Design a protein around this ligand. Structure first.
Ligand code: MG
Ligand code: MG
Ligand code: MG
Ligand code: MG
Ligand code: MG
Ligand code: MG
Ligand code: MG
Ligand code: MG
Ligand code: MG
Ligand code: MG
Ligand code: MG
Ligand code: MG
Ligand code: MG
Ligand code: MG
Ligand code: MG
Ligand code: MG
Ligand code: MG
Ligand code: MG
Ligand code: MG
Ligand code: ZN
Lengths: 55, 96, 69, 56
RNA sequence: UUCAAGCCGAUGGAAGUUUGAGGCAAUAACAGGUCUGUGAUGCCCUUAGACGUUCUGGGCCGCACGCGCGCUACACUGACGGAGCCAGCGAGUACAACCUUGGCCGAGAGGUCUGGGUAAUCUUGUGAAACUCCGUCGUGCUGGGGAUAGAGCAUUGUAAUUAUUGCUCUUCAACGAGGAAUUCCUAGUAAGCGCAAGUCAUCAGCUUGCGUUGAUUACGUCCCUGCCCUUUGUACACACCGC
RNA sequence: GGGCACCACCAGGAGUGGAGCCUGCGGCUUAAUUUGACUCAACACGGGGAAACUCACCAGGUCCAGACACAAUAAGGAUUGACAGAUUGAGAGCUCUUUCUUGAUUUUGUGGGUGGUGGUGCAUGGCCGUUCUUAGUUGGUGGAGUGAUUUGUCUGCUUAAU
RNA sequence: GCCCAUUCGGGUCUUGUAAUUGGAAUGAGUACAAUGUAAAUACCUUAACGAGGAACAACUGGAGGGCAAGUCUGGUGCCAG
């Protein structure tokens, strides 16, 4: 089309029934854990949202 | 693919005896070395085998090379009848 | 490239007109058998002649008769 | 090597088939390379492997 | 020659041009070529009456005509006959059919029998040509020149007409050294001359090499052409096919 | 301004360009006269001297070489074969005449591959050509700049050559 | 973290993950009451019921840089954005 062709063309994938990421302070706690407590692995450098290791 | 089944059987037997197979990449060739069948037919058979696992194929220098995996060997045995403690080239015959 | 020519007439491989339990051979008594047409002279019995208007052949030797029967 | 004569044996057989030889007249041996880094082909192969794997 | 780098000349020396000739040959690139060397390959196309394959007959070779490598000649430093008669690179078959001497047949091409060679051994001294000698034509589109032509004889292959090539006779065209232009070249080079393998069943005017004959003129310069740097100027940076 | 080079010119040679003929490439022609490449760095180049093959083009025919997955027939045949002449360019079963063989290979679909001298070298690899076989290129200190950078790598004279 | 690291491993001590499960609250809701109040509401106070992923459920914007955070997967292919 020549008026929002792309929105109509895509396949609608459905929201997966995943568990709630808890609200308020819980989230903050989780974030903290992710950051400073657990300490993510680094070959040389830190990274917040890593990739599946590939090109 | 259109094989007189006897020929196919013979080919299989030969393969079993070997533990290996070397073919040309030469279609139109009337009869293969060793086996008394068309080379093309043999090649086709090998291809088929590869498609259902079994054989490992290399196409280098107008010469197809073929070796049997354990599963392939088992399949061959089944096709034949021969039970256990048999030829291929998975182990030596005696001392060589 | 250049466009394809398009006369029209296509020819396919014939499906063969398969037929089994064919009306050749017979039995009248029950115990013994009564062969229809004839068997091959060149090859052994079991193979049967093709019957036409003074023309015969057989398929195991692709097609190799001449004499009538 | 494989597991005490297998892959090597197969290779030998293949060779024989190719070049009309008899069993005994071909003898394969699989040896180590004295310093891999000095070799070039090996290095290239390694690089290729790495690429295949998916590395920076 | 600031008596440096070097260069120039004699002497000796096989060699005094980087001793000659090449082989390799940096950084950065080019939208240069090759996806028709490639089971090197992305993606697209196609994908069982294929744009796959495979047979059969053609076609790449057609001709008002342009340019580009080339060969053959415009003869007397020749042509034609005899006679003399000397190279170097090579290459060459047993599962095929290679080079093929030597003997007989044939004007030739080419046939045949026989060998020798898997090769410093045999082909092969590849007694190659251009050359050299004595004779025949003498400066006439002539015996220069050999094209187009017709016929037959050969060979290769399954197949030779759209002459494959060779040979035999016959036909004798254009062209008396080529305007504007422009290529190549500095020594065993240039040019001539043939051989040689490559492709190849058969075809050399091609090609990579080879040797034979063997000069003229510089041994300089930036006039042209290109390229290189330096200094300059720049509204350019996809960079003058620019903006 | 200063260099260098017979792919520049001088001093000369041999030439080509003219002639005929070979062969490339255009243009036209042609069913089709397959394609790649056009200043040097396209044009006796593709090792490209094509008789078929090669071959990609055309006119025509043949063949599956449709791997594998999954169902429709599953022997009351899946499909394989097939002398005889018409058929056919044609001792191509190419088929329509035929009524014998062939035995679960197949084959009819649906996933899925495979091949392509099909395309795009301005999507790539490798190789090659060309700038250039010219004399060019770089970085470590140290100095000049805030800096991009620069100097080294240069007036001169030498050399084939930073 | 480690008593010891002939190989283990107990795990004696401490942390995170499982539609396990279990005990202990909770007020957001409702609701006698009493409070408030001019009268009411609502607040504060209480009895009683009311949580287990199906709820007694947090949205908004962004995820190349500026600028915190995806060279994830498909759909698109100068389009629509
Ligand atoms: Mg066609
Ligand atoms: Mg030298
Ligand atoms: Mg000799
Ligand atoms: Mg004359
Ligand atoms: Mg040639
Ligand atoms: Mg040049
Ligand atoms: Mg040609
Ligand atoms: Mg040339
Ligand atoms: Mg030819
Ligand atoms: Mg191909
Ligand atoms: Mg391709
Ligand atoms: Mg390119
Ligand atoms: Mg290009
Ligand atoms: Mg510095
Ligand atoms: Mg500098
Ligand atoms: Mg969101
Ligand atoms: Mg967004
Ligand atoms: Mg997003
Ligand atoms: Mg960021
Ligand atoms: Zn018969």
């Amino acid at each position: 089309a020549r008026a929002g062709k792309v929105k109509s063309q895509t396949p609608k994938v459905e929201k997966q029934e995943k568990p709630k990421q808890p609200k308020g302070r819980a989230y903050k706690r989780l974030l903290y854990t992710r950051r400073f407590v657990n300490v993510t692995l680094t070959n040389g450098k830190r990274k917040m949202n890593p990739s599946p290791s590939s090109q | 693919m259109l094989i007189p089944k006897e020929d196919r059987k013979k080919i299989y037997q030969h393969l079993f005896q070997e533990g290996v197979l070397v073919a040309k990449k030469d279609f139109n060739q009337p009869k293969h070395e060793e086996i008394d069948t068309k080379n093309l037919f043999v090649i086709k058979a090998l291809q088929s085998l590869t498609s259902k696992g079994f054989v490992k194929t290399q196409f280098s220098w107008q010469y197809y090379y073929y070796t049997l995996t354990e599963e392939g060997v088992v399949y061959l045995r089944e096709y034949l009848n021969l039970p256990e403690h048999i030829f291929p080239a998975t182990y030596l015959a005696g001392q060589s | 490239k250049k466009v394809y020519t398009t006369p029209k007439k296509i020819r396919h491989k014939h499906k063969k007109v398969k037929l089994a339990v064919l009306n050749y051979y017979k039995v009248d008594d029950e115990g013994k058998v009564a062969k229809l047409r004839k068997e091959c002279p060149n090859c052994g019995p079991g193979i049967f002649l093709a019957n036409h208007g003074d023309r015969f052949y057989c398929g195991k030797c692709h097609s190799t008769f001449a004499t009538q029967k | 090597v494989g597991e005490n004569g297998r892959r090597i044996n197969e290779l030998t057989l293949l060779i024989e088939k190719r070049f009309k030889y008899k069993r005994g007249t071909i003898a394969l041996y699989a040896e180590r390379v004295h310093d891999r880094g000095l070799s070039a082909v090996a290095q290239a192969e390694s690089m290729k492997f790495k690429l295949l794997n998916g590395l920076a």
